[PDB]
């Protein structure tokens, strides 16, 4: 009585009556996502039906993590949880989890190729940095930031869509199987900002192998001083590769491309650094001139059985 069903492609959405006019906007392997009008909040929301959360150990573990993390994080530059529910009435029948979220207007792919001024370029990057800083404070390090999981609204607001890992934009320390720290996400922000300017993917690696090539081709070979940090089986391959001398950032991002300018180039040369120990940090990036104009202190500061995962998840839903 409180629920009704609507067919979305091959999927049946059974949702609380407050959610009306479901239209699909996309799909991931986590599940299908519709925009709906929520009659009680009087605004549009995103509703995600989880893909077979108890299918196996990996699904359940990932469903549980998303649910727990969404509930703890709370910040204007991160997609927020509004509601979670299931149409099933007991742990026994428990099948489906629906997550209701804030809805934006577009992902960043369709804004990134267009011509952005410095003010909109800088302010989106500021919001991205604010969202990243908050994720880090909650002990969440993303590592998978890309234009398709950053979303924007027609008022120039921006939110980070999800929580990432646990290949164009991924950091060296990630594609080389090294350790990483917080500023692994700064690389991705550099790759995105670099894309906002050139008008195209900076390191469009056809494969993981071509991926490191394109990086070092553009930026040069990393110094000793990094190889030394490399595990032997990969330290060798990286070491065997042909020595690529690096261009300059004036060369990579020339004045021909800008509408500042010299600033976006400085920040870029500080973010797009292969050796993370020389890469700038989120806090420094925030107070960096090209960014610090917008500053506001209130924004910028186990194993289980499938049945046990199913029980844990069910608690989170209730």
């Amino acid at each position: 009585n409180n629920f009704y069903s609507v067919e979305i492609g091959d999927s049946t959405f059974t949702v609380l009556k407050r959610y009306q006019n479901l239209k699909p906007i996309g799909s991931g392997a986590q599940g299908i996502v519709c925009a709906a009008y929520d009659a009680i909040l009087e605004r549009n929301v995103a509703i995600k039906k989880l893909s077979r959360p108890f299918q196996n150990q990996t699904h359940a573990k990932r469903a549980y993590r998303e649910l727990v993390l969404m509930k703890c994080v709370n910040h204007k530059n991160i997609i927020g949880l509004l509601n979670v529910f299931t149409p099933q009435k007991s742990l026994e029948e428990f099948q489906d989890v629906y997550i209701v979220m804030e809805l934006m207007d577009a992902n960043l792919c369709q804004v990134i190729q267009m011509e952005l001024d410095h003010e909109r370029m800088s302010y989106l990057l500021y919001q991205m940095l604010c969202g990243i800083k908050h994720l880090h404070s909650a002990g969440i390090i993303h590592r998978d930031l890309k234009p398709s999981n950053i979303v924007v609204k027609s008022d120039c607001t921006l939110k980070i869509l999800d929580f990432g890992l646990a290949r164009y934009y991924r950091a060296p320390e990630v594609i080389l199987g090294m350790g990483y720290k917080e500023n692994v996400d700064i690389w991705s922000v550099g790759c995105i900002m670099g894309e906002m300017i050139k008008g195209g993917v900076l390191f469009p690696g056809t494969d993981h192998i071509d991926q490191w090539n394109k990086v070092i081709e553009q930026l040069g070979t990393p110094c000793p001083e990094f190889m030394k940090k490399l595990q032997p089986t990969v330290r060798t391959y990286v070491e065997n590769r042909p020595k690529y001398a690096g261009y300059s950032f004036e060369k990579l991002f020339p004045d021909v491309l800008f509408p500042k300018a010299s600033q976006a180039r400085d920040l870029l040369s500080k973010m797009l650094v292969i050796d993370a120990s020389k890469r700038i940090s989120v806090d420094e990036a925030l107070q960096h001139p090209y960014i610090n104009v917008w500053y506001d202190p209130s924004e910028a500061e186990r194993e289980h059985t499938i049945e046990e995962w199913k029980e844990l998840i069910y608690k989170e839903v209730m």
Binding site: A106, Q110, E119, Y123, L124, V152, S154, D155, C156
Partner: peptide, 9 residues
């Protein structure tokens, strides 16, 4: 100052 309030989609 004054943050943008519109973006073109």
């Amino acid at each position: 100052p004054k943050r943008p309030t519109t973006l073109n989609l």
